[PDB]
Each structure stands twice: as C-alpha cells, then as structure tokens.
Amino acid sequence: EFNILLATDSYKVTHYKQYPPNTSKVYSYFECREKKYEETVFYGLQYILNKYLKGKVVTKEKIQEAKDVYKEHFQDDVFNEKGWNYILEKYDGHLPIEIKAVPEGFVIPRGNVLFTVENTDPECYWLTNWIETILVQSWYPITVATNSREQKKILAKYLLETSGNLDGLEYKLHDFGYRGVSSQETAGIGASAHLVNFKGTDTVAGLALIKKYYGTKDPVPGYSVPAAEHSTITAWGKDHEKDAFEHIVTQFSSVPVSVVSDSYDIYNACEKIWGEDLRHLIVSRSTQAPLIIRPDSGNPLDTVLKVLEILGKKFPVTENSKGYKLLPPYLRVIQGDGVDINTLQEIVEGMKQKMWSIENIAFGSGGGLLQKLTRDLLNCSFKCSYVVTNGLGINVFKDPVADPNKRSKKGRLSLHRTPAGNFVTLEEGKGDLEEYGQDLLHTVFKNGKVTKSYSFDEIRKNAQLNIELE
C-alpha cells in the first residue's frame, strides 16, 4: 500500500509552518535547467500522475499511519494532520492541485518550462511543494529517453553515411539493462523510456508499463530474439563449446539467434568454430534468421574490429553502394559490453574508418542505458516561482551569488512559439500580454483527475528525429 503522505522528503512535513502567514497560493515549475544534451524528451509524468497522484489518495488510515511514523521519525509532533484531514473531508481525498505540462514525447530545448504545479484551494498552499519529491522523479524517464535519443542520432548519422538509408535503425540499440538497474520499478520505467526511441528490449518490465499507462496499437511496443548466455555455453564443458554452438543454432534455425562467443577465446570461436567447423550451419541460414555473433569482453572497439576482420576472411563480404564492407545477410554482430553514449560513438567511428558498414552491427547497453544517469545530467529541477500572500501575487526566485546556473525563473510561466518557430518560456505572467500567441502547456491534472494524456504511439511520433521526419 502506497501512501502519498509518506512519499515526500521528511523536511517537507514541516514546511506548512514556514511559508509567510496568509499564503493562499504556491505555484512551482519544473525545467531541465540550462548549464551537449541541448534538447530533452519530455516523458514519464503520465505514469506518475496515474500510479500515484490521481483519485482518492488520502484516507483516514493513511493519515493515522503518517502521524504515527512522523511522531517517531521527528521525535516530535510536527505533522499537519489538520491539512490532510481537510483534503479528505472536502475533496474525498483527491488532491486540489492543477498541473499543466508540455505534451509527452515533445523535444524541448534546455531551460524551458516543462510543467507547472499549483494548488486550487487556498487552504492547500502547502500541497504544491509536498509533491515536489514524487514529481521530480520524472527526471529519470526524461533522462533515459533523452540519452537514448542522443544515441539514436549517432547511429542514424553513421548508418546513413555507411549504407545510404536508415533501415533497421530502431533495432540498433537494444536494452540489456534489467539486471543492472536499482529496482523492478526502475526497470519498467527506464525500459519504457528507451522504447520511446527504439523497439528492441530484453527488459520485459517495460512492456507492461506501456500497456497499462500509455498504450500502443500494436500488441507490444518492443521485441527480442532468442539468445545464449555464458551459462548455456559453459554448461557443456570447456572442450564442448562447439557442441553448444551447434545445438543452439540448430534449435533456433529459422529465427535470428544471438550467441555469446567469448566464453574462452572469442577469436578462436569466430575463426575456427563459426568460421570453419560450423560454417555449413551458418551459410545455410535465411536473411530473416541470421546468426548474430556476440563478443562480450576486451576493448569494445578493438574487439569489434578484430571480430569483423576475422569474419570477413571466413565469409563472403560484399561492398555496398556507399563503398562499405558488408557481411552476408545471414551473419551479423552485436556488441553488448561496455556500451554507453561515448563508446557507442567511438565504435561506429572506428568501424567507419575501417570501411565497415554500420549495417553489420547492433549494440546492447545495460547499465549505460538505464542506470549510469543522474538528475544532474540535465539539471532536472523543481522550483517555486509565484506565491500569493495577503491577496498579493509576488514573483519569487532563487539566485545564489556563487552559482548563476542555479538561478530560477520568476513569476507565472508559459511556453510559446517564437516567430521563427522555436520555443520560448515567458516569465512574470508576460504570456498574458498575448504577444507570443497561446500557451503551449496543457492542463494534464486537476483536482484528482487526469485531464489529458497521450498514447505511446503519439509519444513516439513526437520524439522522432528530424532525419526520420524528412
């Protein structure tokens, strides 16, 4: 049982006593603060609204539980029982909050308002920032989606250059991160964010999240193929690696199959086992059912290049129309060790310099894709910009003397199109002057109800690369 009264930073329990007396409104906003990663994919708020914020989220039992915990946690009675009881009694436990947000999947430059939050009842001035903690966790799906999309840009650039098209782009970066994230819940959220950009995942948790909170026309948003792990090779005994390989490709003779080949000696496996002993089982395969050789150790670039060099001398290689080398269609490689945005770039550039088409390769990324990310990467941050006290609206902000990068925006905010068609965030309520047309934010949550939402299909469309659009 999730309890929103226990889902905030402890200190926020004490904030209702700290605001100016007679404050009726606290209005706050989220941005990926300006400080690469020049643009961000807005994704993941819909999950939070539906799972945690909507409907009757306050009960008598939840109030009592919070009261009991905080009494011990603070060694003192500081919890706002009356304020929560008010929400329970007046609104049947629905949060009197309004949230406006940019559409999910939208690609927005850094330093723009992405969503805003304010209380709709003056008694609940304290509620706006109570829910900061839970809303700020949107940093994670935003950051995974953004970083995944940046890798898609790299792949698109090199695939286009070496092959002349973008065929298969959406399968070129595969999610291997299930074991390498910090929890089951994180796995689902992160995998779903990667699927905004790609269709390949082994993190099964992502599928159910998308189906429940977003939805797609297709039965599932992501796909995989049969593949070995070291245990299914090594279990055969060291002297029987060939027997393992033969068994596995024969079991999966009519679908693609990935086979980890570095259990003992990746180079021997490629040149002698695949390239000689079992070559007859590989050259007979369909182009719809390639063997995908998987190295998993060594310097990622050096190993990929050597694997390709080996395979190129054992199998028929062609030269595509762009002048790049191409393995036969029944044979491909996947590099799934040590892959992050930096090493991805290094590998594709190294392949290009050695005249290997990016058609030859796919990438798997685990920790690099879903775990090795923090809220600091995009400076995802939630701040109060406007309050009303004694009936007077005041534009408020922070501006620390030793770090201008932490300055926050002032007043009521709105998001607009500029005359050149770019985004601009207007501060100090200046959107009301109507010199920049209509506010692009939409009300997505109001008084316990989700008022606007997006399918996963629409999110994917919003998050497309320009090069995909053209």
Q: Which residues bind ligand 20P (CB under 6 A)?
A: 9, 11, 174, 176, 200, 202, 224-225, 227, 258, 292, 294, 334, 336, 362, 364
Q: Which of residues 301-330 bind its own copies (CB under 8 A)?
A: 303
Q: Indicate which single residue of 40, 80, 116, 129 sits in contact with its own copies (rule: CB under 8 A).
A: 129
Please, what is the minimum distance in Å from the beta carbon of residue 29 to its own copies?
A: 11
Subset of 237-296 contacting its own copies (CB under 8 A):
237-238, 240, 243-244, 247-248, 251-252, 255, 258, 262-268, 296
Helix H segments across 227-293?
A: 230-234, 241-251, 266-268, 279-282
What is the distance between the alpha carbons of residues 143 and 370, in angstroms, rounded to a whole number? Answer: 9
Per-residue CA distances from 232 to 133, 215, 247, 268, 358 (Å): 43, 35, 10, 18, 29
List the single partner that 336 binds among ligand 20P, its own copies, none, CB under 5 to 8 Å by kind. ligand 20P
Region of 163-171, 342-350, 402-410, 449-457 interacting with its own copies (CB under 8 A): 402-410
424 bridge partner residues: 416
What is the β-pairing status of strands 291-294 and 257-260?
parallel
Helix (H, G, I), strand (E, B) or coil at 139: helix
What token pair was written down for 458?
Answer: 């629409």
The option from ligand 20P, its own copies, none interacting with 212 (CB < 5 to 8 A, set by class) reads none
179 is in an annotated binding site: yes
Binding mask 52-71 for its own copies (x = CB under 8 A): x----------------x--
Question: Which CB atom, from 164 or from 350, has the smaller least distance to its own copies?
Answer: 350
95 binds, among its own copies, ligand 20P, none (CB under 5 to 8 A by kind): none
Q: Which is nearer to ligand 20P, 108 or 327 (CB)?
A: 327
Rounded to a whole number of angstroms, the minimum distance from the CB of residue 168 to ligand 20P is 10
DSSP state for residue 340 in the 8-state scheme: -
Q: Which is nearer to ligand 20P, 322 or 375 (CB)?
A: 375
Best CA proximity match to 340, nearest among 201, 144, 207: 144
Question: Least distance to its own copies from the beta carbon of 454, Å?
Answer: 21
In the complex, minimum distance from the CB of residue 423 to its own copies, in angstroms, rounded to a whole number: 25
Burial class (CB in 10 A: 0-12, 13-18, 19+), 161: middle
Q: Which of 221, 250, 246 is nearest to 233 (CA)?
A: 246
Q: Which of 178, 115, 84 is nearest to 369 (CA)?
A: 178
Distance (Å, whole) CA 345 – CA 87: 52
